[PDB]
Amino acid sequence: QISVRGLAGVENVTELKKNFNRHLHFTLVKDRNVATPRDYYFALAHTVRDHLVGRWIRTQQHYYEKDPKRIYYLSLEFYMGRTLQNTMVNLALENACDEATYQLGLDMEELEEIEEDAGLGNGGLGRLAACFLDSMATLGLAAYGYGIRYEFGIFNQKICGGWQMEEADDWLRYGNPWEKARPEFTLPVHFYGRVEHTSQGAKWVDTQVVLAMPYDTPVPGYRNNVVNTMRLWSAKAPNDFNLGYIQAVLDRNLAENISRVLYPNDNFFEGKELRLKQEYFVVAATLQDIIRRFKSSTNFDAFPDKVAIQLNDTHPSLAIPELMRVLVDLERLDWDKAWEVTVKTCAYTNHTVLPEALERWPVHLLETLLPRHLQIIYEINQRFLNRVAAAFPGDVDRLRRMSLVEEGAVKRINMAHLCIAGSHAVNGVARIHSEILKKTIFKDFYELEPHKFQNKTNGITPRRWLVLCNPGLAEIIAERIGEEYISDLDQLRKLLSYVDDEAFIRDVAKVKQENKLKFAAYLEREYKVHINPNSLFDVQVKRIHEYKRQLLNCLHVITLYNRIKKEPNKFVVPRTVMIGGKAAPGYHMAKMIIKLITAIGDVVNHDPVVGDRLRVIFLENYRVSLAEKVIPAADLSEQISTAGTEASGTGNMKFMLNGALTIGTMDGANVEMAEEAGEENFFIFGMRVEDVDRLDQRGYNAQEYYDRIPELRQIIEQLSSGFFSPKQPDLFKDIVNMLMHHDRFKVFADYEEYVKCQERVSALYKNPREWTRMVIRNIATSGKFSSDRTIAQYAREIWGVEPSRQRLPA
Amino acid sequence: QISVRGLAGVENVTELKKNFNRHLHFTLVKDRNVATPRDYYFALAHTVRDHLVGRWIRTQQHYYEKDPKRIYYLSLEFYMGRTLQNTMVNLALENACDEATYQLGLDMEELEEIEEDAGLGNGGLGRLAACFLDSMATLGLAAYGYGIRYEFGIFNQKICGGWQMEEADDWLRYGNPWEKARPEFTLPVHFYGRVEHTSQGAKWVDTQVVLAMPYDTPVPGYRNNVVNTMRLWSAKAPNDFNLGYIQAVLDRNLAENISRVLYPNDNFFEGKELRLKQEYFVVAATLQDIIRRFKSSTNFDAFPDKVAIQLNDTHPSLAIPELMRVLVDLERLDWDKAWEVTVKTCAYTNHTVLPEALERWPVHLLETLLPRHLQIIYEINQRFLNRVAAAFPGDVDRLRRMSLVEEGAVKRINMAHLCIAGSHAVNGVARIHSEILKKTIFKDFYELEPHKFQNKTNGITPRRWLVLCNPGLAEIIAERIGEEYISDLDQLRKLLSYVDDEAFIRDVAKVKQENKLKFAAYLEREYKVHINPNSLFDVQVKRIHEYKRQLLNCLHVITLYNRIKKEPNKFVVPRTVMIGGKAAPGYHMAKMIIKLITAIGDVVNHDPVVGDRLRVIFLENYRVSLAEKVIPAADLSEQISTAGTEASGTGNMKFMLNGALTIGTMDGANVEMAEEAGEENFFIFGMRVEDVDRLDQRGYNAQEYYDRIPELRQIIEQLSSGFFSPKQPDLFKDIVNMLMHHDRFKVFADYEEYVKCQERVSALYKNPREWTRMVIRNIATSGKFSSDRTIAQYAREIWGVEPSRQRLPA
């Protein structure tokens, strides 16, 4: 059908058909007379998987023979989504599988919808890890992703009576055809115990053992025949565990609970023992695998020449003291040599500056669970502070600020301080965020070791986030500039030469229109909801958090509603305002924001005076496969965090690539996006970081905005008085109280500028040719935001390896 | 190599080699350079499995089209052992797989040893269910085995310091290539709740739901292209289960613990809630499947013409009230019609008369867990006792004896009484056992409904227990009489014409000798132990229980030891006495018996005066795959239960088929074995049932035997005084005390006759030609003990279906 989906050759199609029928019979044990759509999906998945395996074996054999430097990306989260379509894209099999299935009487798009997301992350951080794996493979790096195979990933969100309910995401129920269990490479992980000092060093004894069993998933690069590995660890009890008899067997669950469930918080730290066990479990199993692979090539001086460990936030920070433990206690290196090796091996990426998100573990927990690690952390601390004292003598307050050990009611270890001390590189995730790290929270560290601090602006893979989700757009681009842009996204700059081309303008607008129709119909079938596809699709999808300011969007929607009710016969540009995202289960205010959004919808969507001019929809169960559907259909991307809070954002970049315009603050990567496109091609509003600081110094008084802005005062009076909750008139009083007296994110301070900027959006939308021209200018300058760019920078500036676009033989 | 293993055709061997290499690459994702023996085993298993699937699909399609009466064999235990070799035997692929693997540089026998037993049973009862599945398939019956897929089967036994230790049998760790998960046929099972009475009948409401997910395993018949199904249910929590958040997900284990572990008791009832949940779980899921399959062909009058349910002991007895629940509460049949259907559908097999083995559930447990079932049981009871009262008017004591409800401190339900009332057939498992049921424990029921009571003597499959485990014997038999005996074991009677044939006598003795050498070497490699293969191999393998009288064997071993020490220079026929079996974890006396056996070994095996004349070995971890090794190597089979306690036995039959002579009491099937072979060809000793009854009437006084038999008194004095436990002289005092004052199984009363009979064994062993002649007379008359005979009798006399030896097309 479309060129970028590859060739459908007669021999290839014939072979796929044969192998599909072979898997249906032999693998699935079904005949066509009782096979269901799910059986057909599995038969296709097994057929596609078979094309990966020769490449996977050969790639891994190649790394064994050439012995390149190996990159280990350690994360507690990998938000992979579905695999079937991405596999087909990266192996150039999409058109052939389409034709094969078509000839068998099946619709491949319907089969694709049966696959479960692999939802092993919360949002941005997990999804960045997934984009990064795709880019590392595409760039030919000998890279491994290491994590935990959660039995239950991020919960499925149901909305009942306008409230979030959570249900377990039993994603493995039907089986996962993409993973291969490797029970033969199972490794022991130790917990609790105590430390004994011999004449021969420290010994960690009387520990409880849990086994780490690996499951390997292939990670195909884009058309280069490279297939890298994501190795995820699952917890198993040893067979003598607890070994009346029946109870001892049932108690194996205590050990196996380590890998049972993903902690569903985004940007929030909960200091629970189970989470600490998860963190150590992933680090201890991974480090043994790394060392094994290093020894199979005494001499640890070469370790950092052969190994890079990238820490995805502080979550795997125990890698630093574990590496030291192994080197000092087991391999018998002297401390100073072990430390040199550790620092050269490890690098740390910071993803947040919000203080409630930073990991600070109580000492009493580490003392019980990981006594040898606590000893090592104290020794790191004393040696590090000795360096501080020599560089800034007499600066006692700096010694307290920089310590890894925080004093207080409860002593805690600051894991970010540990990561900085133990890493040769520390980076933020967008230019403004990296600057904030050097000026504020890590200022003291930057003064001590300025060379360590870098920036690596985030990106997204253009395989999943253009070719897979928006083939119509990919195709019209390819018609003009060829296909090379899919792995060299800077080539999109060539589209600036088309910005006055009438045929290109028409085709861009047509693709958006098709995507909107297809999304409007998806909504009707799966959720009984009726939208106007001619309306401006105004979309805010991301996790629910006060800093992301879904509430500011709510205030704008109400403002529009109230303006209509005041002048019902005046023309306004029709909108469908779509908001979606999950709230963490214990985050009360986030759950209340969901309820407010649905309650606004209950009023607006049923008011006959409004008609089809304004619709407010809460998109349920936002997840990677939903993002693939809604992002191509969006006109307006809402990126409206308070300046200084969103470290980068990555949703922002997905919308840009897919032909939405952005309304946003100068926060995170929005800054760089506006710089690349031109500020004239972006809807920027609100306080800059410097303005937020100026307000914090004076003191934020929300009452002043309420007193001066009558439209704002009306909304607050409606919320307080029960207008949006007539049966429970006080339902929203916690929201009102927060906005008026304890708003850390200054919602009211950006209200006026936001509403005015939204009127400029509406004005441009009335002129479709100029709207579309501005869209072309955004798509054309989105190249910087490829994760291939990001990864090449990590490779060159941090890991010391060269990317390659060269193919392995097929 | 050998004829009974089938043809190794060039095309077949070529195809097996191709498919092996294809599974190694695509299925296992390994190349030959790093494949281990376990990878080779899996590649072979997948290769063999592929030959089952077409036959499985076609068989199940055939039953759908022809709609025969379906047989459902419901058991809490299926002791399957390994599958690879049995599959190859039944598909006639053994020689071809041998040749294929040989050409690939691999030893198939070594690969076979990697497979884990499927140990989903305790002993005889579970293994009978497995033999029965094999026979049902071989006889062309549309039969299904239904059970529970335990995550942990019977524990692995380790001996440490002479004591049993238990370790979890994590049999699924490496995966099970034989099963197919069927998550699509998942069904709900209800627990707890309460009953509400409407105008429209009773409703069971407010229940907790657990899901039953089926896993299907193929069951190949012998060379007939029939492949039946064993469907095993696994417990899963629903996704809204318990739905702070983290704890709710972790608490899913409470539901999933139902299928976690096999209760490891043999012939003992433990009234625990978890076991009752297991019993209902298997019955509730199975009955829904049965009804579904019946409706897919309103009219329940035809149900018993299309369905037979066989209850393997009382463990699935809740099938009776569940069927009534479904028919009355859900399908709205009147009680009397529902009861008629139930009784015609259900049949019950009793496997024990020991009172501590009988299930008697406390009413308070049923009331909480299964309130509607308790109501139905009470109504069954009142209607049943109304019949009793009409047939035996004024016999009030009979009403109390026959009630399903036992009065007492705690009221209990007698499940055996429930099974009799609700079944159209009740059988025992050997002729003497069926007679005992009619004369003693079920006398009252027999008087009321004599037509219900039958006998079905047990059997064993000659596929696993001759062809697979003893190919050398199978081959020498086939050379003389052909191969038809493998599915018509009565043909072994033709071997009586060879009993004076010098070549046949030589070949029988040669095969036994080879089997003994091969076993003696197995012992050296895997367990560092050194035996004389010229010695008489005297073997008692079975679960450890006081009624089985391993202690009587111990007294004989000590007697022999003491006789040697008294006259060290006299010739005695050399023996290797091998005892093995598992003890239930909470059964203290059974654990003490193990320790005594090992302690006897510690003395006997290290006494230089004894030399190689007497060795006592405890065979660790006795299980199906160990039975396949030791049974062909045995000379003397010890079947020495107190008369009236072993309902049948089946080990007995395996030894007979494999060329051992039997020393035994007239108990269980030993009676029928001696009748078939001739009493002159069996070493019978000890009290008959009638003699045991006569002693119980007078009162058993063990002291009288101690006072009269000096050899016996010496052994007791050695046990008491610390001769076998010099560091802990009182270690055996509980054993001594039991034997002298509280022995329910009358060990001392059979001692003298047992020792005398053992001297006759030794005398015959000195004359190898006459020993071997007697062996031929046993093998030749073992045909009755085929489970094919047993199953044909169930089919004709209970189920109302005709067996077939006809092939489905290949």
Ligand SMILES: OC[C@H]1O[C@@H](c2nnc(-c3ccc(C(F)(F)F)cc3)[nH]2)[C@H](O)[C@@H](O)[C@@H]1O
């Ligand atoms: O760099 C990838 C993305 O990371 C996001 C990001 N930062 N911290 C997080 C984060 C995620 C989970 C957890 C927790 F609780 F431990 F599970 C803690 C912190 N996620 C940023 O908000 C987001 O701005 C950024 O684009």
Ligand SMILES: OC[C@H]1O[C@@H](c2nnc(-c3ccc(C(F)(F)F)cc3)[nH]2)[C@H](O)[C@@H](O)[C@@H]1O
């Ligand atoms: O019929 C098959 C075999 O069944 C054996 C047999 N009888 N009862 C049992 C038996 C097994 C397990 C359980 C329990 F505890 F529930 F798990 C309870 C009872 N096993 C006989 O001892 C044995 O004599 C007979 O050959």
Ligand SMILES: O=c1[nH]cnc2c1ncn2[C@@H]1O[C@@H](COP(=O)(O)O)[C@@H](O)[C@H]1O
């Ligand atoms: O001893 C060896 N001989 C040959 N190849 C090896 C050996 N060890 C590792 N390899 C290769 O590299 C491996 C990749 O596994 P890893 O050690 O888990 O990275 C195998 O799949 C082989 O292809």
Ligand SMILES: O=c1[nH]cnc2c1ncn2[C@@H]1O[C@@H](COP(=O)(O)O)[C@@H](O)[C@H]1O
């Ligand atoms: O509706 C049907 N059409 C055709 N075959 C069926 C149908 N229902 C059941 N079968 C056949 O019998 C089934 C056996 O599955 P069961 O219902 O679990 O016994 C399938 O594998 C089919 O071969």
Ligand SMILES: *Cc1c(COP(=O)(O)O)cnc(C)c1O
């Ligand atoms: C990209 C993405 C995110 C991150 O979106 P932000 O707007 O940057 O927070 C979160 N969730 C899903 C499912 C995503 O695809």
Ligand SMILES: *Cc1c(COP(=O)(O)O)cnc(C)c1O
């Ligand atoms: C046959 C068998 C049994 C039953 O043996 P009995 O002597 O009849 O009790 C027990 N366990 C295993 C492993 C068997 O193969």
